[PDB]
Design a protein around this ligand. Structure first.
Ligand code: HEM
Ligand SMILES: CC1=CCC(C(C)C)=CC1
Length: 137
């Protein structure tokens, strides 16, 4: 289920984070603008940029905490508020987070593994709803 999936992802988080974030940027090339430093790079080049591995793993570190603190795939409002309020998310709208979770669910569906892809899909929708409620455009 969802909680086991948190444990699975955490057991190889650096590689899951990079592969899911690459799936996101490759599915939605326009999203690299938020990361202008990732333009004109192949997957292998990106996985050799310090900020790429460091920042992507920190994104998923916090994403797993938010997933872990959720009840029935509904995140804490306090977690939503942190994500809306972070200076690094100044630019963003809910659509950015929706696209990331579409890529994450697709990744899970295409993997050989028994991820509860349906729970992650609900988690993404519930996080987008919570981000809107916490004042993301
Ligand atoms: C649940 C989803 C997400 C979580 C938990 C999250 C978390 C974080 C964290 C912890 C950082 C700080 C990383 C660091 O400074 O090393 C960060 C930075 C950032 N996040 Fe997010 N993030 C999420 C989704 C997104 C999405 C969807 C976008 C854009 C589409 C985005 C854009 C950024 C940007 C531009 C930065 C700063 C630039 C950079 O770190 O290189 N994040 N995020
Ligand atoms: C915060 C943050 C930094 C870098 C990445 C890369 C995987 C593109 C993701 C989000």
């Amino acid at each position: 289920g969802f909680k086991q999936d948190i444990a699975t992802l955490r057991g190889d988080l650096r590689t899951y984070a990079q592969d899911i974030f690459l799936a996101f940027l490759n599915k939605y090339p326009d999203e690299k603008r938020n990361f202008k430093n990732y333009v004109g790079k192949s997957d292998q080049e990106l996985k050799s940029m310090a900020k790429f591995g460091d920042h992507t793993e920190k994104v998923f570190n916090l994403m797993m905490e938010v997933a872990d603190r959720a009840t029935d795939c509904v995140p804490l409002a306090s977690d939503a508020s942190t994500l809306v309020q972070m200076k690094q998310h100044s630019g963003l709208t809910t659509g950015n987070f929706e696209k990331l979770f579409v890529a994450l669910v697709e990744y899970m569906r295409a993997s050989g593994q028994s991820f509860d892809s349906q729970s992650w899909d609900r988690f993404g929708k519930n996080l987008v709803s919570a981000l809107s409620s916490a004042g993301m455009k």
